[PDB]
Design a protein around this ligand. Structure first.
Ligand code: HEM
Ligand code: HEM
Lengths: 472, 470
């Protein structure tokens, strides 16, 4: 058993299998982390996921962890977790299965010219999918629409199989739901065969993502066409493993985007001021880009710049994620060393984890007054432009909004994710009349079973009503 | 990391913090163990609760694990688990904190002469609590109120200084017990109690009420608690709080299985008309010719140990209810490296490995119990209407076929009292009340497997029933 040595942080004994564990018994990961802050101050160590995990919780010390330090390994833990959860051999080039740098592949094909073609394809796919009042769970609606749109955008479409396209997508959606469901457990080292349904779901998704089946598809993303090419040319992976590297991309493209979309839609519709400000901005932008909206007419086309210069939508989305983001931001100690923070100096052993839990900052009332209130204009300045000035103890923060991470540990899809959510909100507002069945119903609590994993979904779905607009 | 070596069982890769973990993600502990049987056969090793746990799932090998084995330590894990969940220093006499043997203390105060007084007191306490409109209520919630209070008063006595506020003391303890017990599957697994703020305060408020200074104010305390106070004071160097926590252990053990056991026994009996009829007829016979009349505004019913014991219909109804709800992990620790010889073969076990049975697997085995998921109220009755003790597996007569109280030295010291209290409760319900379910044709609730490993599993949801004084 491990004992706190000299200069080491306070050590909380107790095994925490994973952050969302024991939710059914009344566990609350956020409040648990807060309670340790009060007990131990801003740096403490938990036995978390079979690791020793040093939480750094002072917003003003974040920059000391997010810089490219000499004793930080920002990939080891991620690579190992991906292997476990998806079931493939290591993709760390250091283990000799590939010479590919997957991060460069993501950056290369998720930004620049590639991003433009993704964005354009998503807009086209969203309109094909989205074109009386219908009542439905809002999460379930966002799941259908966004899953299909994102799947077809990243993995292209099977045009030989047109009439069985809705069957294939519904199977995939269902399989994805069942696999993603158990993901918090998988990351933690719990065996997938404890989850027979999720295990079958996973392998069925992997099957559908074998190169043999992806070669039948057209308008495949540049990301997946390149990843196929480098699987083939730079790795000694077998055919199933290859399929699972594409499953890693399916999961990453989907697991945060779906709940982010829900929250952004829910929070807009729920708050009449947000809805009015969003509705006007979208009208103004479509009007003077000359884009007509109709169900049967020609599609809408928006420039990168027109999509990007939507500050109200950006603020709505940022505020939605400030409230729902629950990532564990992680790196591993390359060796024994001393970490120097504003809070003091702490000795860290080799292979210890150094973690941030930025939800603690996002909900900090010192940085964000009334932190639990959705303020649609929170990230707008006096000019109605995107606001970038936020403070802690009078000091201007470099890191204050982190739902995509930061540094080298940063979502390569982040610009695309924002584009796709903006596109969805644009189309929802343009195409439909929208009402909450319970306009006064409390906001669902976050479901903290996925704490650590990204954007948290609602604990319960909420019903809403939608109706195609008539344009006069 | 550990690998499977020569002669060791199949080693399952994967961390399992506790058996009821990840239920929210669709885990199912019973089916998980069955799936391992199928894949690996009757002996397999899981990384469970931070240990390497060898499961022995062939019923014909149970006898080789349950015998007083020279290679087994049947107390090490329990002592350590108790210390963690309740928050006290080791009670293992090897660790110098006490020289008391608590097993002997339990046996001495829960059986023999001591059992007579416990049984009498419970029957008195039950009657005081249970004594004309139809009242509708959740059946589990009802069994919880009544059995918790009856059992708390029987074990810990009554404060007669403050009769007018006793209902309030009991209600606070009841609520505090619920909150502490809710988190118990996590605690045994090593999850920290302070991760459950409400349960932690609840645990500590219960402990406060069971300090010797507060127990001293109480009267008609059980010989169990009196003797345990005595041996705390004379045989240990425990502090005042630790002394309270040793009494909290007993509160928990006396309550956590009895409450769900009672619910299942009542529910199963009301829901199955042939069971209700058989139980009603038997109870009346026994009261009649023990010369005991039943009235609300009358004198207490008194039954001997023999009269209570010779109730085979009630005994079968209780056994069959536990056959269907019992989910204990029966554990012992390997004192050293050794070879375990089973019907299945021979397996090398390491020092500090756990050897586990999960008897729910045998209780629900269709080879032993035809139609295992059906409650047959006469399943433990023979042709003669007396207790049936002959059950077979592959044509071999089983020594171990009904194990909800455990067996061997790892056996509930309170089992006789437990059956009496449930019999007494069922006798009084039949005697006092008209009873019916709101949905008599409604489905049986599923077991709640978040508590898998811990004893009798409660229903996942409560069910409503109506009652009325006759
Ligand atoms: C609101 C939507 C999204 C959010 C909040 C989000 C957030 C994140 C976060 C926090 C990480 C982990 C970074 C770290 O390790 O610290 C990540 C990684 C990643 N994200 Fe996103 N993401 C979103 C959508 C997307 C989309 C649409 C894609 C497009 C394919 C994507 C692709 C990826 C990939 C491939 C990684 C793995 C990075 C690596 O280890 O090389 N994400 N994302
Ligand atoms: C239906 C009701 C009950 C059931 C099914 C039950 C079952 C069990 C089981 C399975 C064990 C662990 C056996 C092992 O070590 O393998 C146990 C232990 C224990 N039981 Fe019960 N029990 C019940 C009610 C009671 C009652 C009413 C009491 C009253 C005091 C009680 C007192 C205890 C105690 C003190 C232990 C700890 C044993 C030790 O460490 O010496 N139980 N019980």
């Amino acid at each position: 058993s491990r004992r706190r040595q000299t200069g080491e942080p306070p050590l909380e004994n107790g095994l925490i299998p994973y952050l969302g564990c024991a939710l059914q018994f009344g566990a609350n990961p956020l409040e648990f982390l807060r309670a340790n802050q009060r007990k131990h101050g801003h740096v403490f160590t938990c036995k978390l996921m079979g690791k020793y995990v040093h939480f750094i919780t002072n917003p003003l010390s974040y920059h000391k962890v997010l810089c490219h330090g000499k004793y930080f390994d920002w990939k080891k833990f991620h690579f190992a977790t991906s292997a476990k959860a998806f079931g493939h051999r290591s993709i760390d080039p250091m283990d000799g299965n590939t010479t590919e740098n997957i991060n460069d592949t993501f950056i290369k094909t998720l930004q620049g010219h590639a991003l433009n073609s993704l964005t354009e394809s998503m807009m086209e796919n969203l309109q094909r999918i989205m074109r009386a009042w219908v009542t439905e769970g809002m999460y379930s609606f966002c799941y259908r629409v966004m899953f299909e749109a994102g799947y077809l955008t990243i993995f292209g479409r099977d045009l030989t199989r047109r009439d069985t396209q809705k069957a294939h997508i519904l199977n995939n959606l269902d399989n994805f739901k069942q696999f993603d469901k158990v993901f918090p457990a998988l990351v933690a080292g719990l065996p997938i065969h404890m989850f027979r349904t999720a295990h079958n779901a996973r392998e069925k998704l992997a099957e559908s993502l074998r190169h043999e089946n992806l070669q039948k598809r057209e308008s495949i993303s540049e990301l997946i066409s390149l990843r196929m090419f480098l699987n083939d040319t730079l790795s000694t992976f077998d055919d199933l493993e290859k399929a699972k590297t594409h499953l890693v991309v399916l999961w990453a493209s989907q697991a945060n985007t779906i709940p982010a979309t829900f929250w952004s839609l829910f929070q807009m519709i729920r708050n009449p001021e947000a809805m009015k400000a969003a509705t006007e901005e979208v009208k103004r932008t479509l009007e003077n880009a000359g884009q007509k909206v109709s169900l049967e007419g020609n599609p809408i086309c928006l420039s990168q710049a027109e999509l990007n210069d939507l500050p109200v939508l950006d603020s709505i989305i940022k505020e939605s994620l400030r409230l729902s983001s629950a990532s564990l931001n992680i790196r591993t100690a390359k060796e024994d060393f001393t970490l120097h923070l504003e809070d003091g100096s702490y000795n860290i052993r080799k292979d210890d984890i150094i973690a941030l839990y930025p939800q603690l900052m996002h909900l900090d009332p010192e940085i964000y007054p009334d932190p639990l209130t959705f303020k649609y204009d929170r990230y707008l300045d006096e000019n109605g432009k995107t606001k970038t000035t936020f403070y802690c103890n009078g000091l201007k923060l470099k890191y204050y909004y982190m739902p995509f991470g930061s540094g080298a540990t940063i979502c390569p899809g982040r610009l695309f994710a924002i584009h796709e959510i903006k596109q969805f909100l644009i189309l929802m507002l343009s195409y439909f009349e929208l009402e909450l069945i319970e306009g006064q119903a409390k906001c669902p609590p976050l479901d903290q079973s996925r704490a650590g994993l990204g954007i948290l979904p609602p604990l319960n779905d909420i019903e809403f009503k939608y109706k195609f607009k008539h344009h006069h």
